């Protein structure tokens with residue numbers, strides 16, 4: 001009820017980001033939403049003395065039919081001061097990624113009960129555009145903590161920990177983690193028990209609240225079952241020339257990750273100009289080298305460590321037939337997580353929808369494990385991505401991304 | 416008197432750390448000085464400005480212009496310095512409506528709101544920064560000092576503050592009269608509707624009554640301007656639109672500047688005139704920018720210019736948008752990286768047209784260009800109409816499926832249908848996913864000494880076929896492409912090719928059908944003639960025979 005003083009970083013003005021084009025249905029939905037928010041005092045109309053802007057659009061949360069307003073606060077978040085005044089930070093709970101079930105709740109509506117510092121409100125300006133720019137865009141700013149702003153969970157952190165205090169000590173084995181508008185609550189019990197303690201949680205914010213439009217939904221994870229991928233080599237009875245070339249190529253690549261990998265006995269097998277489909281018998285020396293490489297690849301990569309002061313980088317490869325591989329790392333060849341998706345749902349004919357869902361699930365895994373979002377290297381042309389990703393987005397955060405325009409040779413090795 | 420509502424004032428600040436202007440007043444002739452004194456006395460009576468005392472330390476130049484072919488002077492305040500120090504504002508003029516997104520209107524009335532502009536109050540705390548001084552006769556007295564109480568012409572904030580003030584005033588009228596549209600531009604309000612001419616004029620009278628609630632008068636003698644309207648380079652009519660006349664000059668020699676102006680006119684015309692082309696004329700502007708240099712027109716630019724003249728022979732108009740109907744976008748390939756499109760709702764009645772040009776880049780193909788054109792039309796359509804059009808594309812559904820399922824990137828184009836209007840976009844080659852049984856295997860390699868620029872390229876096959884070619888003025892990358900070319904040239908209709916060139920596979924995996932490299936183009940020409948090609952990559956200098964034998968042949 002009284003405002004925390006907030007400021008931008010030194011020598012840094014507010015965001016001035018262009019509003020991107022919105023469809024008729026989106027603009028309409030936002031006009032209806034913002035009219036309600038203005039009546040509730042959450043936002044106010046602003047004048048032309050406010051030159052700042054942050055893009056807004058509208059989405060559908062997973063498994064619902066009601067529009068949710070989503071503000072792209074990525075630039076404001078970069079420019080906003082870092083929040084270490086009461087706490088250097090919330091030391092990320094390493095136990096969250098070890099629970100059997102983690103449910104994600106959209107608690108962002110609770111943020112609207114705390115006023116935003118009157119001097120900082122101007123930096124939250126946004127515009128509802130009109131079709132064909134036929135009428136002036138409707139300009140608002142926030143009067144309360146906005147959803148999607150990195151300062152909202154920080155300013156609300158003191159109020160949230162008191163809200164949850166009765167639930168915490170009645171259920172001491174439960175991990176509860178807050179990232180932006182999401183609450184992650186992990187448990188090891190039966191899913192039926194799990195779902196019931198989730199709804200017990202919901203009551204605590206129901207009670208304190210007196211209505212939250214998206215508090216009742218739950219996206220359930222199982223980080224205990226999360227799969228990884230070690231490097232594996234084929235097991236064959238007959239090797240063609242082409243088979244051995246692909247093996248040597250894959251081992252050459254793997255030797256950047258594992259020092260002890262050797263390929264010289266195997267490369268000697270290719271000595272000769274034989275047809276690509278001709279079977280080559282392995283020499284004893286080549287089979288021993290192959291066996292020793294297999295053993296090396298069963299071991300973890302040497303010198304892999306997470307540094308919270310460095311960015312996480314996520315790379316994605318399209319493997320065809322709806323399957324996608326990805327790696328998360330900070331230094332090249334020191335992967336912190338790798339994986340593969342194929343279950344991308346409601347998109348067997350839409351490459352970009354599949355990629356958008358992959359980005360969202362990789363970001364979710366990143367938040368659970370390290371408490372921050374990776375920067376993505378996307379195998380897509382910038383113009384294709386920017387035209388369509390907002391049509392399939394259903395998370396309340398947005399990571400940063402860049403675009404890969406040269407085809408990687410490494411795609412063959414992660415397949 | 417009738418009380419009038421004050422217009423709420425916008426708080427204005429200077430840029431952080433900056434102070435107001437302190438610029439010297441230029442000396443003026445006895446002639447201009449008395450002219451300013453009379454104008455400023457009049458303005459002071461109307462409340463626009465106020466005389467100030469001597470302690471205000473700020474000053475902005477005032478001038479008197481001789482309105483040409485008249486004995487009447489008039490007053491201009493040079494606000495350049497204050498504008499540099501004034502804060503930024505939100506400008507809602509950035510995006511202008513496109514005519515093709517407008518709706519048909521039976522009537523459009525114009526109202527003059529010019530005398531409402533100098534009635535918008537200026538923030539009291541900012542007025543001190545607008546101070547100016549009329550020089551005295553013979554500089555024998557202090558100059559007469561004034562400051563503004565209203566938005567001054569030429570000040571940075573006046574357009575945005577005036578627009579926002581008018582919008583706020585107009586909002587309740589527009590909201591409670593949804594059967595009209597209101598658009599403000601310069602000192603005029605444009606009001607359009609589909610209502611019977613009597614109801615329409617009743618709405619206009621009601622708008623005048625609404626505006627008088629703030630003391631804003633409108634001339635009762637109707638505004639000169641009536642449809643059609645000349646606006647932002649367009650002609651707006653009640654039921655159709657076009658661009659203003661596009662006249663391409665006859666010139667026997669062409670300047671850099673002339674060709675720039677020619678391309679600009681063609682670009683403007685291309686939004687309603689179908690099929691406009693600018694590639695060959697744009698090629699003449701490459702790299703140079705001495706605006707007076709004369710460029711001989713290639714024969715290819717002369718033909719494209721002649722083609723454009725014919726397209727521009729007679730007027731073409733677009734229709735307005737019907738929100739109750741789908742949008743259809745149809746695209747044609749024109750050659751040399753050029754694409755043209757039409758957007759319509761009923762056949763033969765275009766809302767607008769446009770074009771797309773191949774992006775700068777070493778290698779390309781038709782499918783990628785068509786994909787980019789689709790995304791450009793999609794984005795423009797969201798801006799203008801708020802929805803994606805349905806597409807009619809010169810590419811077979813089977814061609815598209817083969818492309819996107821196998822392309823290394825994610826790619827997508829929205830709801831579309833094949834239209835069989837040549838030239839069709841097709842896939843010119845597709846590489847095998849597995850080695851070909853019974854096809855000869857070519858192990859290729861090339862290398863060059865980077866000092867000598869001397870190189871070799873060649874191959875060795877499973878059947879003992881061999882070739883090495885000596886090369887001059889070449890590079891490692893060029894010799895690696897040459898080796899693949901030789902293998903394609905000397906093989907039968909099915910071929911397996913083994914290379915260690917990461918560079919060559921990077922290019923080939925991008926599936927080009929056209930290149931700025933003649934060597935890549937020659938490779939493409941060879942690929943098109945094959946039945947089956949399998950391309951295999953191996954790492955270099957590992958002892959992989961075939962590649963180890965010919966590496967030794969080419970690096971010698």
Ligand SMILES: Cc1cc(/C=C/C#N)cc(C)c1Nc1ccnc(Nc2ccc(C#N)cc2)n1
Pocket residue numbers: 134512516517518519520523596597598600605606607642643644645646651652653654
């Ligand atoms: C953008 C705009 C420019 C002018 C005019 C600018 C000037 N000068 C006049 C109006 C009223 C508008 N606003 C809108 C909004 C929606 N449909 C239309 N349709 C429409 C406008 C003019 C004519 C005509 N003749 C026909 C249809 N206009």
Ligand SMILES: NCCc1c(F)cccc1Cl
Pocket residue numbers: 743805806807830831832
């Ligand atoms: N069927 C005529 C409308 C239409 C469509 F429904 C889907 C794709 C293209 C086009 Cl033009």
Ligand SMILES: [Mg+2]
Pocket residue numbers: 860862915955956966
């Ligand atoms: Mg070599």
